[PDB]
Amino acid sequence: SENFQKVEKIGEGTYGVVYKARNKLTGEVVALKKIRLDTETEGVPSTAIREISLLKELNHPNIVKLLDVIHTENKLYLVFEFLHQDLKKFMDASALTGIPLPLIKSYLFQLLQGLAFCHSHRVLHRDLKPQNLLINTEGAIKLADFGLARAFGVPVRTYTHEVVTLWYRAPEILLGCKYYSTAVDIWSLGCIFAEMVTRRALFPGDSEIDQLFRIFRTLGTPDEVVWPGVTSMPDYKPSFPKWARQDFSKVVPPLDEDGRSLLSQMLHYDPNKRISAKAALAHPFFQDVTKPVPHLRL
Amino acid sequence: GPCLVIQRQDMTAFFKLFDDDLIQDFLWMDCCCKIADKYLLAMTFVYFKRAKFTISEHTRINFFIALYLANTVEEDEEETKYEIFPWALGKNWRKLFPNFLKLRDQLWDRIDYRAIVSRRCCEEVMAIAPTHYIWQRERSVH
């Protein structure tokens, strides 16, 4: 690093440690991400190459900007634009009062704008969670952590099922069915949208078979009409129980008629009939949308 | 704009890699095209021009590190790409593979970490000479 004065430690994981730092180009406050280089192979992880290779070509106002890439014998640093806090930290801070509806609307519209840019430029985020979405003091949200992200442009390429956290995981992956796309990311943002309104996770599962049951608890067990190929799947068993699909009015009480229509289309069972990032932006829900500053007091 | 003019001598030097008996045996080995298909072979040429490889730098080892990078970027199945190690590191690959990965990162550094190769670009490099047999290497099951 050298030319970066480390202020404080923020994040940490299997990937590495995230810090707050300054520069030689003024007091440019940044997010310095140190990568945990493998013990035996001592090679750059596949997740790091994919993240750096994608972000070096993604320049959208709702996608976290990559500034510099420092690579040495045993080190790999990632310079990012500093953003005050993540969505999870803001949802925890506004867990009792609650995030205001115009601000929920603003964030969803901004996240959709960035995701539409990804899907149009054939890129799957594959890891949309509140910890992986960064906010700033002037009311702007960004798509962060492109670690599990990949370019879906090239055809006949192979795809893995170990992609996103259970809570935001698509049912077409929960039912181990191959051939997934753009719709997977939509399912994660639909779960994030509901979480912002009800102040709690939509389907908080404890396992893979429990996650599916939490989905069929709310959206009901799917039939061969809502999802044409629900039974004909690699990880399907006839022992699956049929359940009633409770109305969205009950599911999300503070959301309006338009908000319920958008949420349902995002949480659609069929990936070929699930709303696209482009179609969701056009929804009548975003007709009275404004960009408000988030809550911050001493 | 992200433009690059590809000359005859750039594609001629790249096709000379397939004149080596080790390389032709390696392509033969890969029947299902899991690790070295037309798109991954389109990607390996793209990486060569990106790293700005000279005539003397057009070696068999450089072909495998670029193909491994293409498999690291576009293929989610991590297990399949390990078949590259015995073809470039001989029959002692079980402990020779980390030094290959160091070269793979060295090439990734040489291309300014721009390892994303689009379908549009792949179809564009394929179209220079579509009559070539390496572009006749199609896949069906991912």
Partner: peptide, 19 residues
Amino acid sequence: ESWIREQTTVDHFWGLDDD
């Protein structure tokens, strides 16, 4: 002897797709 295109201009060499 080799039969390959003498001069080829690639509009998009670096970057991602568009759809």
